[PDB]
Amino acid sequence: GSSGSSGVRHTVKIDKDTLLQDYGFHISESLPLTVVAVTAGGSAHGKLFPGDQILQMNNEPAEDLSWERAVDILREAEDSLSITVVRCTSSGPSSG
User: Subcellular localization, per the record?
Assistant: First the structure.
């Protein structure tokens, strides 16, 4: 019975750019890896967005994985990076 927050998980791949010298999107140094910025038309264009919470990185549990560890996964990824995030929105109390 795999069920929970409305937010659905979306597995998207990423890659480093030759001009932006980065994987398009960025990540906060804090423990709770949360998309801080998402290039507009780069590698993580659309695939990700500033506000989501990383759930998996290169086939690894985010819970037992912190920014520090992720920083090593972002570089390790040579061919591509299998990053997964959730898509949840404040629905309910939202008033206008």
Answer: Cytoplasm, Cytosol; Cell membrane
**Method for this entry:** NMR
Count of CB atoms within 10 A of residue 21's CB? 7
Q: Which residue bears the tokens 């659905």?
A: 8
Name the phi and psi angles at 84, rounded to 5.
-125, 140
Question: Domain coordinates of the chain in residue numbers?
Answer: 1-96
Q: In what helix (H) or strand (E) does residue 70 lie, and over which residues does it extend?
A: helix 67-76
CATH architecture designation of domain 1-96 = Roll (2.30)
d(CA 57, CA 40): 21
First to last CA, the chain: 34
